[PDB]
Each structure stands twice: as C-alpha cells, then as structure tokens.
Amino acid sequence: SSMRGVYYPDEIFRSDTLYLTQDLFLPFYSNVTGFHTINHTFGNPVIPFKDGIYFAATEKSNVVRGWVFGSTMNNKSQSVIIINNSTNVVIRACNFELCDNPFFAVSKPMGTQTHTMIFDNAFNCTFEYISDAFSLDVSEKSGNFKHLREFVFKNKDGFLYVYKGYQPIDVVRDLPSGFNTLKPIFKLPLGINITNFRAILTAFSPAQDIWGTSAAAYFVGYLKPTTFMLKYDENGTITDAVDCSQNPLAELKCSVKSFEIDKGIYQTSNFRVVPSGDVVRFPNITNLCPFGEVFNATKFPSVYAWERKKISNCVADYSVLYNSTFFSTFKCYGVSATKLNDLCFSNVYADSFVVKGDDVRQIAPGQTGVIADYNYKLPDDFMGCVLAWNTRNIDATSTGNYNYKYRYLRHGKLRPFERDISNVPFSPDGKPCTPPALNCYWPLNDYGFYTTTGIGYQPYRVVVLSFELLNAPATVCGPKLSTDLIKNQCVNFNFNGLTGTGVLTPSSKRFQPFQQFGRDVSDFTDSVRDPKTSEILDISPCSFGGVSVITPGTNASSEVAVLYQDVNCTDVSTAIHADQLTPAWRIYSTGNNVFQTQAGCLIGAEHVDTSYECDIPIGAGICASYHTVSLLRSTSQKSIVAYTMSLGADSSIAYSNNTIAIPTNFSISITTEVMPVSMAKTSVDCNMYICGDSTECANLLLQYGSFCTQLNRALSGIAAEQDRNTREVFAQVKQMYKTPTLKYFGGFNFSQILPDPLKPTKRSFIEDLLFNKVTLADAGFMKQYGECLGDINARDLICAQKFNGLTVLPPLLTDDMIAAYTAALVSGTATAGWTFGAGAALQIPFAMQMAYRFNGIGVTQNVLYENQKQIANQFNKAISQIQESLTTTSTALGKLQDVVNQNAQALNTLVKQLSSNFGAISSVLNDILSRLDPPEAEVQIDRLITGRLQSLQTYVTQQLIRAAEIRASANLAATKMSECVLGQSKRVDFCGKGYHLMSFPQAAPHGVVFLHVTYVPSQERNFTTAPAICHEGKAYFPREGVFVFNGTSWFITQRNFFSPQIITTDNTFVSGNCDVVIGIINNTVYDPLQPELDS
Amino acid sequence: ICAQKFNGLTVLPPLLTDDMIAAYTAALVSGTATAGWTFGAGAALQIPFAMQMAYRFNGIGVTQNVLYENQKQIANQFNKAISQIQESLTTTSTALGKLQDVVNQNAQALNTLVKQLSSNFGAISSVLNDILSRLDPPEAEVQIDRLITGRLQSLQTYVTQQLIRAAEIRASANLAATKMSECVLGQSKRVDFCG
Amino acid sequence: LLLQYGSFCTQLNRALSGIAAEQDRNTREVFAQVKQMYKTPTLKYFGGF
Amino acid sequence: TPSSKRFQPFQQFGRDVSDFTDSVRDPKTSEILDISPCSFGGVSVITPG
Ligand SMILES: *[C@@H]1O[C@H](CO)[C@@H](O)[C@H](O)[C@H]1NC(C)=O
Ligand SMILES: *[C@@H]1O[C@H](CO)[C@@H](O)[C@H](O)[C@H]1NC(C)=O
Ligand SMILES: *[C@@H]1O[C@H](CO)[C@@H](O)[C@H](O)[C@H]1NC(C)=O
Ligand SMILES: *[C@@H]1O[C@H](CO)[C@@H](O)[C@H](O)[C@H]1NC(C)=O
Ligand SMILES: *[C@@H]1O[C@H](CO)[C@@H](O)[C@H](O)[C@H]1NC(C)=O
Ligand SMILES: *[C@@H]1O[C@H](CO)[C@@H](O)[C@H](O)[C@H]1NC(C)=O
Ligand SMILES: *[C@@H]1O[C@H](CO)[C@@H](O)[C@H](O)[C@H]1NC(C)=O
Ligand SMILES: *[C@@H]1O[C@H](CO)[C@@H](O)[C@H](O)[C@H]1NC(C)=O
Ligand SMILES: *[C@@H]1O[C@H](CO)[C@@H](O)[C@H](O)[C@H]1NC(C)=O
Ligand SMILES: *[C@@H]1O[C@H](CO)[C@@H](O)[C@H](O)[C@H]1NC(C)=O
Ligand SMILES: *[C@@H]1O[C@H](CO)[C@@H](O)[C@H](O)[C@H]1NC(C)=O
C-alpha cells in the first residue's frame, strides 16, 4: 500500500518546480487496512477518524453509497452525512439516529434517491447541498470492482476537505502501487467535531453478481504530519513525490532539492540521543515548619487571645494535616488543599482561636460579617485556608466556658487582620467607648459548650493559615521526593535545582568538603555531589553529531550507507546487521551492519582489506566506493565498500653507483588548465528589498542612517573589479593581429583552435565546446554522466531574481570581444612566437620557432628537423583528443561551474530570508499595516527591518570575501598569460607538466582555459657511465651532456635524448690530473686536427 | 585538544593521517636522492648522486670539475650543516612560530565563541531554564529572543572570522605547493625564492 | 523560536563544511605531487653525503 | 498582462519559484492574468570633468 494518496495541497499552484511542504499526508509504505468483505464476512463497522483518512474502494455502481462522519453519528450532536443518489452527491449536517445498518434512506420528491436529497429524517439540518452528476462519474467506467474510487478526507479549521481520483483496477480485492494525484472537490464549512465515521452500503447487495455480492473491498489509511517534496510539471500537474521521512536516501534527496544525486558524501541532519529516564535527588529531610505551636496547643487561644505568626525557611507537613482524620471541617479559599501538600511559597501567615460550633459559618477567607469582622478576620489576598477541630471534648465547659467568650463587636474596625480582637466595650462606629458607661457596649456571651450540648453549640478550635506567592525565593515548600540514581545512561536529572540532561557517571574527581559541584574550564558544570549519598558524580552530555549519507550516483544505484559522525557505535541503533539494507522507516532512519572509524560510526558499508585510490573520502585514511565484492550476490555483487586508501603505485628506483638512465624517445602532449576570472556583476535596490514599496517602512528605514548607500558603495567596488580582472587577463596583446587565411603551418594544424570565418558564430571550435558545457544560474548546462545539452532556464533572465530588488549587470567586454582577444593571441603566437611579448611582432616560420623552443628546453635543434613529421603527427592527434575529452564529459570544467553555483546559492538564500518571520507577527508588511495600530506596527516593522538589514550585511560580506578569492585567480591567470603564452617559462610545473614548449589561451564563460604544449621523454635505455675520462695525464670532462658506454665504446650524449657522439677536443674540456677525480675511467679523446697534420 | 566535542562544537580528523604525510615526504626525498629533477618532468631516471650534484653545480654557473676536485670538502660541509639543523631544532622553540600561531588563533576563536554562551545580551539570565521557570510565556519568548539574537550574532561573527582565516591559510598552501614543484622537483633560478 | 530566523543555522553549517573540505585540498596539493611511491633505499650514504 | 499560464480549474493564482505571486484568475470573469513589477532601477550620471 504505497504512492497512493497525494493531493494538491491547496489552490495556489504553479509550474515546473520542486516544492517541499508539510501536511497531513499518507506516509509512503504505511499499512492500509483492507476490509476484504464477503457475505458472512460482512457489516459496516464504525471506524475512528483520527487526524483524517485516505479512503478507497473497488467500485463502479456506487456500491459504497456514502459516508457518515461525526463524534457519535447517532445521538445528540450534529453529524455530516454524504450520500450518492444515483445521479449525484447529497450532503447534510443533521443529527441522524442510525441505530442499525443505516436505512433511514427517505428522500425529497423531485427524482427521489436519484436527484433530490436523501436521509431527511433528523432534527438540525443547518447545512444541505445538492451536487450535479457526482455518482454518474463513478458509473461511467466499465464494470464494478474493475475501478478504484480513491479519496482523502481531512478535517481542520472547521472545514472538511474532500479530495478524489478515480482509476482502473485488475484485481477486485487489491490496492495497486500505481502513483496518482487526487483533485480537491469540497472545502465544506460545517464545523463538526469528527472523531468517528462509517461507510454506507444502505442495505445493498449488488446485482453485479461476483459472489451474490453482500460484498466488496474498501481500504482505510491514516494521514500523518509529514514533509513531502512534490514535483510539478509545465502544466502545473504533480508528477512525482518524495516522503522525506521514509529512509536515508529520501531524506538526502529532499535535503538536496533534487530527484537525482551524484556519487559523494552529504551532510543531512543531526543525531541526538533521547533520555531513557529521570533522576531527582534532594538532601536529608530537615527544617520542618513550626505548625505544632499554631495547630497543637493543648488548650487553644480564645477569640481575643488569638495566637498569630508568620513562618519561613521550612518544609511544610501540610500533606499529613490534609491526610488527618481529625478536623471537623477544613476549606481553602486559595489554591486547592490537595496541592498545598506539595506547593511552594515565599512565606505563610498563620493563627488559631475558638468558636461556638454555629459561628464557624463566618470565619473563612472569602467570608465577612459582624462575627468575624470583630475578632480575627484576615485579608482575602493570601492563599488562605481554614481548619476546625473539637473544642467540645477538651477546652469547653458544660456551662459554656466563660473564659472562651464570644466575639467582641466593634463596628468601626474596617481593616483586615485588625478586625477588632480586643476585650473592650467598643461596639459602635465612633462613640466614646470607655469601660461600661451608657455611651458604649460589649457582647460577652460564652462560646465553649461541652459535647453533650446540641450539635449547633458543639464548639471548634480553629486554625487559619495563609500562604504568600511572590517572584522572590520560595522559603516554604511541602516535602520533595528523591528517586533512585541511574548511572551510565542518558537521563534527565535534578540536584538541588541544578537541572539538566546528561550521562551521570561515578568519578575520581576529588573536591573539598564545602564544595557542591565542579565547573570546568568552559565554566559549564561537569560534576556534582549527590545530596543524599555524598557520592561524587561526573556529568557528560548525551551523544550527538552530524549524520552523513554516502552514496554512489542514484543513476547507478539506490543503495546508501550512513555515517554517524564522532559517536561510538555502542550508542548507535538497536540495529539488524545486514549489509546494503537500512530498516530505516522504523529504525533511526538507518538500522543495519556496523563498522567503527575515527570519523564516527559507519553503517551499511562493508570493510575491505584490499586498498584502492580514494573514491569517496571519509577521514583518518578511510575512503568508500561502489565496488564488486562477492560474485555470489548476482549484480548486487556491487555493494558500498570501505577501505584504507592507497597513496600511489609502489615503485623501486634501482639506485646505482655507476649507471645512468637516458631517454631514447619522446612524446609531445597537450594538457588543459581551467581558471575562473570573474563573477556575475550584481546590485541590490535595498530600499525595495527591505520595504516592497511600503511607504511607512521607507520612513522607518531612514533612522538607521548610511546603510543603504554603504552597501551599494561596497557592491559597486566588487562590480567594477570584474571588468578589471577580465581586462588584465585578455588585453595583454598590443595589436589585434588578423587571423591568417592558411590554418596549417609546417604540418601543424591550427584550424581547431583559431576561429573560422566561413561558419559563424565567431569563436574557435574548442571555444564552442567550452561555451556549451557550462550552466549559468539556471540557464546554460553541464552534467558529469554526459546526458545533457541546451539551456536549463531563460538566459537573458539568468533564471529569476531580477524582480525582488535584486539585479545582475552586463560585463564591459562581450564574449565576442573576449574571443577576439584569444584569436589575436593565438594568431600572433603561430606567426611570431615570443617576439610580440617584448618588441613588435616579428614573422618567423613556425618550424623554426619550434626548433628554438626545443633548444630552450635543452634538446638540440637537429632533433626537431630530423623528426618534424612525427612531431606534427603527435601534435595534431593530441589536439583531437582535447575535442574528444570536452565532448565526452564536463568534469574538467568543475571550477567554472562552481563560480556560478556559489553565486546562485548566495542570491537564493538572500531571497528566502525575505519570507522569514524574524519574531514579527508576519513576514508580510500589508498584514502588519492592516492588523494593527501604528504604535504596534512600528515595532513589528522594526523587527523585520532589523532582520532584513542584517541579512543584506551578511550577503555583501560574503561577496567581499568571494571577490577577493576570485581576484587571486585572476592575477594568477594574468601571470600565466604573460609567462606561458607570450614566452617559455622554465618554472617547473607552472605551465603544463613535463618540459614546457608553448601554450594557447581559449575563452570560457566566467574564465579562461590554457592548452599547454609540453615535451615528455618517454622511453629510456640504462647505461654504464663515468664522471670524467683520463687520456694522457689529465682529466677531460664533458662541456655539456654525459659520458656513457655503448657496450662497445665510450660516447658523449645530451641527457634529454640519447645522441651518442665521438669524444673529442671540441665537446670536452681539460682540468687537473688523472688522480684527482673519484672513479675516473681511462680512455682516448679524439683530435680532429691530427689527421690533417698527417696530410 | 582541550575537551571541545561537548557543547555543539566539534573538531574533525584530516583525510591524510600524519603517517601518510610522512610517506609522501619519504617518497620525495628518496626520489631526489636517486633520480634528481627527472621524476618531476619525466619518470624517475636513476643517476649517481655525485653526478646529479655536478649538474646542479653546472646550473648555478660553476664548472663541474669544481665539484669533483672538492667532493670530500663538499660532502663534509653538507653532513656538518645537516647536523647543525638537527642541533638547532633540538635546542630552540622559536623557529616554528608560524605553525604554533595557527593553533593559537583557532584556540582563541573557539574559546571566545564558548565564553559568549555565558554572556547575558540584556536578558534576565544567560540560562534558558531561569527564563522558562521565572516567567510566563509572553515574557519568556522576548527574553529568549534576546539570547537567540545574541548567540546567533556570535556564530555569524565566528564563521566570518574563519572564512577570512581560511583564505589566508590557502594563500600559504598555494605558495607552499609552488615551492614543492619549483624548489624540490627542480632547481628554480628565482633569486631568494628557494633559500 | 529559532525557526523564525529561517536559513541561518543551515547557512552557517554549509560555510564551515566548505572550509573543512578545503583543508584536505590544501594538504593534498602540497604533498601528493609524486607520481609513484618510491621505496626508500637500503643505503643511506651516497658519494660521501 | 494576458498570459499562457495553463493552470488548473481549481487553482486561483500562481506563485513563482521564489513564491512571490506572479499570475491570477480574474474573479469577475475567469481570464488568467500575469503580473510583473512596475519598473525600477539605479540611476547613474555620466559626466566629463
Ligand atoms: C495491512 O495489514 C493487515 C493486517 O494488519 C492486512 O489485513 C492488510 O491486508 C494489510 N494491507 C494490505 C494493503 O495488504
Ligand atoms: C469530539 O467528540 C468526541 C466524542 O464525543 C469527544 O470525546 C471530544 O471531547 C469532542 N471534542 C470537541 C472539541 O468537541
Ligand atoms: C440514540 O441511542 C439509541 C441507542 O440504542 C439508538 O437506538 C437511537 O437510534 C439513537 N438516536 C436517537 C436520535 O434516538
Ligand atoms: C440539535 O442540536 C443542538 C446542539 O447543536 C441540540 O441542543 C438540540 O437539542 C438538538 N435538537 C434535536 C431535536 O435533536
Ligand atoms: C500539457 O498538457 C497538454 C494537454 O493537451 C499536453 O498536450 C502537453 O503534452 C502537456 N505537457 C506539456 C509540457 O506541455
Ligand atoms: C541521610 O544521610 C545518610 C548519610 O550516611 C544516609 O545514609 C541516609 O540514607 C540519609 N537519609 C535520608 C532520610 O535522606
Ligand atoms: C493536632 O493535630 C491534628 C491532626 O492533624 C489536628 O486536627 C488537631 O486540630 C491538632 N490539635 C490538637 C489540640 O489536637
Ligand atoms: C493519605 O495519603 C495517601 C497518599 O498516597 C493516600 O493513599 C491515603 O488514601 C490518604 N489517607 C487519608 C486518610 O487521607
Ligand atoms: C546513467 O543512467 C543513464 C540512463 O538514465 C545511462 O545511459 C548511463 O550509462 C548511466 N551512467 C552511469 C555511470 O551510471
Ligand atoms: C566505545 O564502546 C566500547 C564498548 O562497547 C568501549 O570499549 C570503547 O572504549 C568505547 N570508545 C571508543 C572510542 O571506542
Ligand atoms: C617514438 O615512439 C613513437 C610511438 O608512436 C614511434 O612511432 C617512433 O618510431 C619512436 N621514435 C623514435 C625516433 O624512436
């Protein structure tokens, strides 16, 4: 059950793109419940709806005649019902009864069950709807069960969204894997709380007699919040999709925004081990609150004696007091007594006294009147609570205890707590209130009656307490639990309020008796004393690191291996140790065969002992590749392997005390070198980029001062310099030499590297390959497999960007002007050699110019003229192999392609940061200016302006760095132009490789390419040799070259090319005597004069 | 390197280990001792080391016989001067200043990025658990926005420093790779370029 | 809260990954210029040197 | 402007690759219009001394 159930996410849709989005999609390869349904295996069972469902059925005649959705679908509350009349869909919102197989199928008069609506039977029809032909569209296709009706139902924001598609079927009870996309049909506003549903067969048993047909098949699968990448075509159609959760390859190609991936290692996500448990530790129990005084005095205070306090820095036993069977009543006005058992506060205020049983009615926090107002009533502003217990048995007396008097009225004491406590004739609001004279009065009844009085009289001792809540330190709390300790696992933990997540370990970390926990050199905490055991624990973080995917090209294989960076494989997954296959959907996006490296834990690759060159790099000398490994596995004999890299081919120079190796033959070579020279010249209208023509944003921007001019000054410097770079590399020629008619000098064929006038455009044939094989921002093209041609996007628009305040500007020299400078340099080089790089250009025959370039590398001139046929044939062949190479693959042009790709990523990141929220209510200025008043809109806009302006400073700073990095390559290229092309550099490996003969420049987009011509000696003899020779009395030494032995005879030769010559007075010089030199051999030096004296 | 791998910061291994680097230096020296310049341009062609030296003497414009007639003095001065390099490198710490500086600058940048975690940025604390326990959410988010903006400005600062320092090391690596091809594989005549 | 600022924690990782890959390019371009691994000679002493 | 956007019967308007709005279905009578920004740019002044 897979690749079903994708729908167009909304109505805003658009052409030819990869769009990555989050929604309640059906995740790929989840198990759908197939209700295979047949006669006795039969019913319409109610099913939970959850977050929404993919639903499908094998169908034609609308056998699934409808659906019912709601909380209950039968009683009290409204329900949505959807029914196929024989033509059309019916919708109602009514609270239907549906006690059985649902057959309340009564319908309106105009085409009953056929056109006008059905299920009329209920009591709250707040919505009703008639469709057109939405049951005939099912009935259109040929034969029942030979088609699948396919739907998504999702409920959010008070809307039921309905999407559908309808497709052919071959198996009457299966759900095929064929990809198709559902269209939206409805966004029903009905607001119903759907949590359950059922399909409707409405007592049907179809005349489509496959089984007698109290039977069908239908399918339910739950939607889940998942990230899909959706691929649109040029008609705005979804054509493909990727569930980014499924496996590490799906995650990779979502992260890369592509459906195809090249061979490489890619970073995709962070691994971060979750905690297994929780550890809470607190000290030995101590500092119990002094409640025994307030609560457990043997005889309590009278109403007027009223013992009272406030208490702090203590642990409250209130859980016990609440758990106590004693108290006749207790009430909290504040937060519930059930939580005061464990809650924390800055302090408590507490007091105690007595009442005749009746007056407990008035004493509470939240309660006031002339009883409590004139002997104890507290302010109702604390977390106040009140408790009562038996005075009737203890501190009562049978007369009524005349010491435990009644409340002492004093109407004028309006203030809380003061609420006249006092034993005084004081009852009025303001009369003189001495002792007993006729001005003033005292209620003086007895409260404390004994337990044999009626249950009204029966008096209570009473306590009130009042907890105080502040941001200040909570000096009172209920008791707190300590857990078991959990060593050697990632856990949550808490000491005395030092909370974290980590791995707790036993430790050797000695520290002083007064110290509770250790910091480290970073000043993060790393060790703690256990408050109960006094164990010295050491804390380290739970394992985390980058996750990287190792892949061949997806072109070649969809197998992948995964590297968890830096971690020990012991911490990594509860795996199943197959090579090749990650059980990834369930197991850690990964889940299989394991290997350890210093880079971290490597999964799914096989370790191989045979070394190879490094294909995909990993670290610490480990590399990976896609390789044949076991012929027993059929084509899957190719798997990902990991190995220690080979440094190079092993070799053994046979060092000899008296042997020298000298070349007998040579090979000409042509080597490409590719260099970047300039970036895309860019500018940004910062006031449009920030504000989008919001006038109010344009006002607020001015407060920041120079920035919008400063950034444009900086980019104008970078932009001007791209023309300086391009000018300094190419404009080294003094004069524009005309390209000659004859393209062929002394057998050497230039016709592929000069322009051709007979066949426009006006570039060399090799420049046409080079201008083809590069991708601009998304215009142009290049691919490493060799499977691409023609621009991937609009060229005069680069791909997009020219509409967001961003702009890109033309170069000063057009590509035709660059191709005119290379045509000038090559035609000058072919007709005049080094001379135009010093004086004026001097004509010289190309064969002679080559002989003097051979002479420059220490190969004597005659070697060229005697071999000119071979040298021309090797040159002409090597030029043709450059065309074959550039035609085959663009992998040589990677440097020029990268200059574009970095600039594309720089602009696309700068554009994406426009959409970013930055802690405003919205990233859209029209929202902020419509939803709010100006004094709030200013703060919202200021957050956007600050975010956007910081985003521009980032981009221009990246471009300053990148421009400086490109300038270093423009200066190096300008140097190679002067030294390699205009001359013959002797700097080893500066121009080409081997001995340097000459070089030709060629134009390329954003760069230059050099074709270096070099001479490589390539076959060698191995000769006996001597440092000097002794003739008569004296050592003779070679003027140039080496003395070597031909097996027969001693000869002298140049050491770049074996050319054995007679040893003579001409090619040797004398020094010293025969004894001085080590290992001098004894042989004749010939004299050209002696036979002429003998004449 | 201190502890490092334990606050989101991490340091990764190089591809070539020091034991692989030390194989390439041994290959380059033993090529230079037995085949001279030849393995740069062609394949390695074996040559007796005294004759290789006589041709390198001819390259500076001193006639070959000045070597052969003095070979004992020249070998003694060579063996002597190599031993002084070993003695000097045994004795003094100051010679490798450029390489120790590369370590020190990275150590300072990371320890600055680390200290900025403890910085307050005008919030009520630099600890998220203080903010999340002392306040209700409408206040807590604004106090966290101060820390997030502070910490994110500190990362954008650090990455910009490393981008500049990486270009400064690259300009040294390109020069060093050039001294390899010109000074080791050959006999470059550029005055005071090689020694 | 960190999601609201968009790209930056991806962008910073791409920049550090670029610098990190280049350290192997620098180290390779200096040392890996030799064509073949020439085995070190048994004799350490040549013509007196 | 009038446009060649082929966009589907349920769709109302198009976003570009950067997801700014680029085209719309006229709600009073269903033409497919395409929207481009009003002209903007740098001004530069060219001068002798
Ligand atoms: C999903 O699993 C159930 C049993 O849990 C099975 O009956 C059903 O056929 C499976 N789905 C499919 C498409 O086969
Ligand atoms: C939705 O309906 C179910 C079933 O009666 C009920 O448990 C749930 O609390 C309801 N939720 C709402 C938001 O009404
Ligand atoms: C209410 O619940 C009973 C349960 O037996 C059911 O028969 C009845 O159809 C439901 N609906 C109404 C509106 O009574
Ligand atoms: C219809 O629905 C409302 C709640 O939406 C309920 O109060 C009312 O009693 C219902 N009426 C009948 C007759 O079922
Ligand atoms: C777009 O839809 C039309 C429908 O006739 C079809 O002809 C065409 O091939 C489709 N694709 C493209 C890329 O135009
Ligand atoms: C108190 O500390 C001692 C220290 O030895 C320990 O044994 C005991 O378990 C602790 N008791 C409580 C109640 O924490
Ligand atoms: C003592 O403690 C009990 C149990 O919590 C409490 O109900 C009672 O009121 C207190 N006072 C006396 C005098 O027992
Ligand atoms: C006392 O507290 C415990 C808490 O676990 C509870 O199980 C018990 O039922 C309580 N008893 C009374 C008398 O409140
Ligand atoms: C890549 O796939 C194409 C077909 O899509 C095929 O022609 C080509 O040979 C493949 N190349 C490799 C190296 O896998
Ligand atoms: C990794 O875990 C193993 C135990 O499975 C342990 O022996 C080893 O020391 C740990 N560390 C490393 C770096 O391998
Ligand atoms: C050099 O090698 C080439 C290889 O094609 C061969 O044709 C030629 O005869 C050789 N030249 C000499 C002078 O040995």
Ligand SMILES: *[C@@H]1O[C@H](CO)[C@@H](O)[C@H](O)[C@H]1NC(C)=O
């Ligand atoms: C020069 O080389 C090109 C290579 O394609 C060839 O077409 C042309 O005929 C050659 N001309 C001569 C005169 O050899």
Ligand SMILES: *[C@@H]1O[C@H](CO)[C@@H](O)[C@H](O)[C@H]1NC(C)=O
């Ligand atoms: C080359 O010649 C020498 C004598 O000078 C001989 O000893 C040696 O074995 C030969 N080497 C090869 C590679 O043929």
Ligand SMILES: *[C@@H]1O[C@H](CO)[C@@H](O)[C@H](O)[C@H]1NC(C)=O
């Ligand atoms: C070089 O020696 C060979 C045999 O090794 C001999 O045939 C030849 O004549 C000698 N060369 C010359 C120029 O005489």
Ligand SMILES: *[C@@H]1O[C@H](CO)[C@@H](O)[C@H](O)[C@H]1NC(C)=O
């Ligand atoms: C090396 O050559 C010298 C003369 O140049 C000689 O004295 C010595 O014996 C030779 N070494 C060997 C191993 O033959």
Ligand SMILES: *[C@@H]1O[C@H](CO)[C@@H](O)[C@H](O)[C@H]1NC(C)=O
């Ligand atoms: C060898 O040396 C002697 C004495 O210097 C000299 O006569 C002789 O000519 C030399 N040998 C040859 C073959 O020239």
